[PDB]
Structure 1
Amino acid sequence: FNGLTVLPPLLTDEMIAQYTSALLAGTITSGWTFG
């Protein structure tokens, strides 16, 4: 480093995967009604 910093994202990869799983399960089971 030389005065350079990298900050971590607020959302972790597991949380993003959880949103993806939730969206996909909702669209499989309900259709478009959950939107």
Structure 2
Amino acid sequence: ICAQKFNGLTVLPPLLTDEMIAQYTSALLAGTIT
């Protein structure tokens, strides 16, 4: 599983978390509807 990827293999988290990304889409929606 994910925790079993001990040896070497790792997964760096994305720079933009998928909760501040939702702010980007919120801004795009806010601009495109107003």
Shared fold (TM-score, shorter chain, > 0.5):
yes
Structure showing the higher helix proportion among its residues:
1
- Partner of 1:4: helix, strand, or coil? coil
Shift of 1:5: 1.1
Shift of 1:8: 0.6
Counting only pairs closer than 5 Å after superposition, residues 1-35 of structure 1 correspond to structure 2 as 1-28=6-33
Task: Tell me the number of residue pairs that the alignment of Structure 1 and Structure 2 aligns.
Answer: 28
In percent, how many aligned pairs have the same letter?
100
After TM superposition, where is structure 1 displaced by more than 4 Å over at least 4 residues in a row?
A: none
Q: TM-score, normalised by structure 1?
A: 0.68
**Which structure 2 residue ranges, 5 or more long, are not aligned?**
1-5
